[PDB]
């Protein structure tokens, strides 16, 4: 048998999947995940895939730091994964502009508060529910010269020259972050 390698974390909006190599040949795998002081919990028992969904385990506390390891079967051979702190590292999904109404010389741009995989009281918490004040939205717009706006909520109230048309784009952003601080630019919408 061969120990797994290149263990990587694929997480977006808390949908966290651990991947590795190589493509199993006469060997199956079993993953274990835990917090530094917690017990080890097994997942994806004797799977032949080179991935394992750990979303249900990590959403129990997104601010914890998890370690996972992939066991190999023909103590068993294994390989540890990088530590993973959901709250600090999960990528922000692509935003979606929910709408924008004009009011004379101003335009209110609303950013749809997308949902995450974090279950809470039989429901899915939004991006806002989880990050609260740590999440802001930035706006990249132009008179259909660049322009930008920022908001600590899900809406932008900006000034616009009456008559001319505008195009918008937004990015979810967690300023405090060091890595993965911004999501990809949302699709463009024009008034």
């Amino acid at each position: 048998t061969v120990a797994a390698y290149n263990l990587t974390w694929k997480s977006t909006n808390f949908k966290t999947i651990l991947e590795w190599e190589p493509k199993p040949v006469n060997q199956v795998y079993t993953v274990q995940i835990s917090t530094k002081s917690g017990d080890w919990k097994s997942k994806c028992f004797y799977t032949t895939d080179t991935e394992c969904d750990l979303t249900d385990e990590i959403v129990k506390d997104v601010k914890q730091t998890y370690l996972a390891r992939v066991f190999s079967y023909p103590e068993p051979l294994y390989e540890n994964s990088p530590e993973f702190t959901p709250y600090l590292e999960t990528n922000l999904g692509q935003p979606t502009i929910q709408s924008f109404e004009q009011v004379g010389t101003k335009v209110n741009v609303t950013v749809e508060d997308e949902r995450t995989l974090v279950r809470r009281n039989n429901t899915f918490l939004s991006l806002r529910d989880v990050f609260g004040k740590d999440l802001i939205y930035t706006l990249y717009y132009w008179k259909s010269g660049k322009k930008t706006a920022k908001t600590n909520t899900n809406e932008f109230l900006i000034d616009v020259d009456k008559g001319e048309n505008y195009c918008f784009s937004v990015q979810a952003v967690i300023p405090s972050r060091t890595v993965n601080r911004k999501s990809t630019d949302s699709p463009v919408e024009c008034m």
């Binding site: 002081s37 080890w40 097994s42």
Partner: protein, 254 residues
Amino acid sequence: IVGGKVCPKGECPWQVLLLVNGAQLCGGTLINTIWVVSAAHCFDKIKNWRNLIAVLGEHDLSEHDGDEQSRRVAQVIIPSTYVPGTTNHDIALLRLHQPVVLTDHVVPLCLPERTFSERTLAFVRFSLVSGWGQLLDRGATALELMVLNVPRLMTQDCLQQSRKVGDSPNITEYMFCAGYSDGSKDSCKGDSGGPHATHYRGTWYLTGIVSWGQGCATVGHFGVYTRVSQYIEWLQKLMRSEPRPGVLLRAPFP
């Protein structure tokens, strides 16, 4: 024990105190009213085999009370593969001359089935190690029973996290590391033979025996305990066996 705390009288009821010629020798673990599990190296320099005593329900070596029960050790069974002075197969099964009385202060630790211990208990992060051993590396021993909660490590991690010491003992499949490498908490010499008890869903089980390690709470090193799971069958067979003439007995392993 280094970096631990006093085990409140009665909360470490399976702890055994082993004496030789009336002197403190090692720790042990009661697993039933007649048998005690300890470490084989605790007997490397024994000469008066008829002078081994096991004390149950102990707590404070400076004050006697009615919870103490003494029993002559009628037999010390060590694996045939064990070599005095070396680390492998550091286990011993002791038969008491007369059963001890189970009470609120004297209770046996459960000996688990092999697979249960391997597939479940082995992944329970924390476990308790205890004894009247040294409180500091090279320091003096404890008057009151001490206990410490230590985290378990798979050998690959232990090796990777332990700084290579010139020609140090291999951590075999009959061992496992547990403790901290920051030099603050670990068991020690005087705790040898003592239990490494794991708590699982309301019941405590025997998963290890204090065996060896680089000094006591040495930076870059972990404590090493005998992996009891590898001896379940060996122990059960002996406990159903007839007593032998002499005290010392070497039983084949496997």
